[PDB]
Write a protein that binds this ligand. Structure first.
Ligand SMILES: c1cc2nc(N[C@H]3CCCNC3)c3c(n2n1)NCC3
Ligand SMILES: c1cc2nc(N[C@H]3CCCNC3)c3c(n2n1)NCC3
Ligand SMILES: c1cc2nc(N[C@H]3CCCNC3)c3c(n2n1)NCC3
Ligand SMILES: c1cc2nc(N[C@H]3CCCNC3)c3c(n2n1)NCC3
Lengths: 282, 283, 283, 283
């Protein structure tokens, strides 16, 4: 009988439990992510502040449900306090110190086997969310951070600000179970896999022409980046980057795919990712 | 000029033409299925009774059209009589005595792949006919697939049109332009039946709101030792039937053209664990 | 900075610029296509006349945008004049003299597969351009595919924008998020044209409400001896074009990336029965 | 009988008349503003490109009507051309080389009150013209106020009609009766600009949902030592422009009749801290 706690929204002042610093960990959509310290344990945590509204409360609740998943940033506690007379919602999460996804890759020969291990970890985050009827709708590398600078660090998905719930006899078809989109997550998965295997997006900028290339579905696997990469892997990208959402690959299908399913037993054929990624163009 | 008869709803008392017994052949959705006897011929027939309403008249009319198909239980005649002052609709069908689909399979204790294919072909012809005349069954499951006789030459036939529904009112005109229509649920059903035929248990067991998830997510397995000896072609066919998204799923025309179905004669006899696994009734 | 001219609707009498003959080049949907001559150059051009309305002005405007594409009949100038007190819209295009698609095929009594591919590639570029600027032709058939001259170097061009319609008003944004749009009918049409090119007859003959069925169902064959020598790759391409469900069907970008099209030069010359089979006019 | 030309939208390729360079004069709302050269005269002009739609055509038309006003950037000619198959709208304007409003003020000596008034008068005449022909700019800010040349006789001109909008379709008839209409936002903007001109910083700094508050509430100060020497008359004029309630706020006609504006010549030269305070860029 495996039961976990419900979400408790703490009403007491956050400063009773945490030392809140002004150190900005990262600027983002909903605001500044601040570094804070647990008074009793002295561990570092991240703090995200939002104006308290039902939409805000809905997202936090989804993230809370999601926090059980190993590859989703864990919400440790949530407060509802009063800041400047405005009713605010303070969200405390595990501090991910290992940096963004692509930042780690460029700071080192990058193997294919390691790309697969990354894609498998990102996919488990989507699989969990989709299996509990949650669509992230903002899966991009800015929202994939490592827990520590350590090389055993686990990769974790963050920012549930666009997250949305997808819903309120053995022959009943999926359609009959009810109307639902989460295909955009899988599109995002395809873009991320593309950049991981090569080092640049499949749709660059010019800009109203980039809107076309997406709508049309026109992208290439140009050499010398892609020459050494298998037809199997290119096929997987192609099924992720399907223009029509109903044609596109589902998360269950993705995770069952050999390249993902066998992250252990997969070629180490070097990639140009680390090199190509190095082009900052400041 | 091949013309068949229109549906005639007989107003005369059914007891003039048939001896109606109280022997219950099977309890079902719309009620009890009774065994009856043709007075003039003395043959056994099944009788289904429904309250007479336009919805009822519509289903019967669909079944009647369908009754020309070899693998759909045949409606022999239809009566509209008065029972208890309520206006009733009495449907008389060919009587199927050979038992449900899986029942026959478990009572031969070795089941071959070739024979599963022949079954799926026969079930598919029933769906092909229905779909080809714009009818969606929407209740294709083993309970509604019965054999004509206990004989081993028995032909398998589809029954229960209670959820049946009609799907409708220059050589370059596309399918979409011909009109707006779903019948993909019949193909999902076909996939589930094929899964159970090849192994002996559903692809989605019960835990229960988690089973709703496994269907919506499309997660199922081909676990050994049941599926080990079954080909990648067959698994692929199930995989195309059990597509979560209806527009992605296989159509009936595609299914019937697939080699495993199209060549039911020239297909391996590789034994299946179906009969064994099916034997677990768990009373 | 590659900029081309905007559409200018000339208000001056067309007779000032052109000698308009009474020779009918072809009868069609929106009217007769008349042969005309540029006074100053003495070149042959085709003239299409429509009643001037915003629907007419919109189509013309699309054809104008499309006229930059090599495989789309070029609009040379457009006039708005008064004819019989009714306000008319006179469209002048390049005169295509080489005849319809299948006419040129049968007048060479030995048609190779490689040549079919080069045709499909040319037709596909016309669709690719249109779809890439959010235009859907919705009337792609051989009647509207004509050659520029009787010359064998003639280029094939798409015509008749009377049913043309516009399909519209952060690197991770999905195509669905860019906005709601159909142009899959153009790809179906492409599949039908390809079928006839490789064999000599449609994939859906007539009988007539049965032909409506065969389309809606997706039932067509690759019968021998027409198709025996044709590869599985090519049949597979037709099969993806003739998908009943529009969302399953092949997109133009996908079509043009397909090796048979992409490698129109490095493709077998395996003879086709097209020229022979096509010859049966049955007058 | 003082009549001016209507707007002619030229269809010919802009490159026929102008040499379009790749030099970006400024990045903006609707796109990059490129420098171009008139082939026949060799003068420098600015080019703004927009996607051609009725909304785009509406704004351009307003700007065209407005271009007669001395203090509004002058549209010299407009083209409708085809760029990349997309139908575009190319707008050619007089080129303003003198830089933005505040840029000039800092690059100098002290800044006098008399000069601020002359600026406010020039900006007010732009609003007065627009409002008198029922146009509301809705984007009057310093970024959109540029000088014609680096010369100190340069005239200040309003730009960017991307948010511009038309405010409309017996001597005792009240203004309300003439019809329903907002252009008070242009006057609020005028108040903010005047505040910054007299001191060197906005009246609403950032602290961000709290800056939304300070605006909604209407809370701002005239702090010393910036405002100490500035008269009660000038402060009062700001207070009438910065009225929270739009119906309470000053109209353009009232603004221009106000003595500080009306007597830009006969007004104190009391030095301002603007030039000093503005110098704080904080890179
Ligand atoms: C939990 C959440 C979080 N978000 C972070 N930064 C966010 C900012 C908004 C977009 N995604 C990245 C950072 C973190 N953490 N830790 N640690 C270092 C920077
Ligand atoms: C025609 C129809 C029919 N329906 C039957 N039984 C139905 C009951 C409802 C669900 N499907 C099976 C039986 C039959 N028949 N014969 N013979 C034996 C039992
Ligand atoms: C441009 C357009 C056009 N349309 C033509 N004829 C149209 C008639 C309607 C259906 N499609 C073909 C002909 C032409 N042209 N040339 N030359 C010979 C006959
Ligand atoms: C006319 C219009 C225009 N717009 C300009 N730049 C705009 C960019 C959008 C916001 N306002 C400023 C510049 C110009 N001009 N000249 N000359 C130098 C820079």
């Amino acid at each position: 009988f495996h039961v976990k706690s419900g979400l408790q929204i703490k009403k007491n002042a956050i400063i009773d439990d945490y030392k809140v610093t002004s150190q900005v960990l990262g600027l983002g959509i909903n605001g500044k992510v601040l570094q804070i310290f647990n008074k009793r344990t002295q561990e570092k945590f991240a703090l995200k502040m939002l104006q308290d509204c039902p939409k805000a409360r809905r997202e936090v609740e989804l993230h809370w449900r999601a926090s059980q998943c190993p590859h989703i940033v864990r919400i440790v506690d949530v407060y509802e306090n009063l800041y400047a007379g405005r009713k605010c919602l303070l969200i405390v999460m595990e501090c991910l110190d290992g940096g963004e996804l692509f930042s780690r890759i460029q700071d080192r020969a990058f193997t294919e086997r390691e790309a697969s291990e990354i894609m498998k970890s990102i996919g488990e985050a989507i699989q969990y969310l989709h299996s509990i009827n949650i669509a992230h709708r903002d899966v991009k590398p800015e929202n994939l951070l490592y827990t520590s600078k350590r090389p055993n660090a686990i990769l974790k998905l963050t920012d549930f600000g666009f997250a949305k719930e997808t819903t309120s006899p053995y022959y009943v078809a999926p359609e009959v179970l009810g109307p639902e989109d989460k295909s955009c997550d899988m599109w995002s998965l395809g873009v991320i896999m593309y950049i991981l295997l090569c080092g640049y997006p499949p749709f660059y900028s010019i800009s109203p022409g980039m809107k076309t290339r997406i709508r049309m579905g026109q992208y290439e696997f140009p050499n010398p980046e892609w020459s050494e990469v298998s037809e199997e892997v290119k096929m997987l990208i192609r099924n992720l980057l399907k223009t029509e959402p109903t044609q596109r690959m589902t998360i269950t299908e993705f995770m069952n795919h050999p390249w993902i399913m066998q992250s252990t037993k997969v070629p180490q054929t070097p990639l140009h990712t680390s090199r190509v990624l190095k082009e900052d163009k400041e």
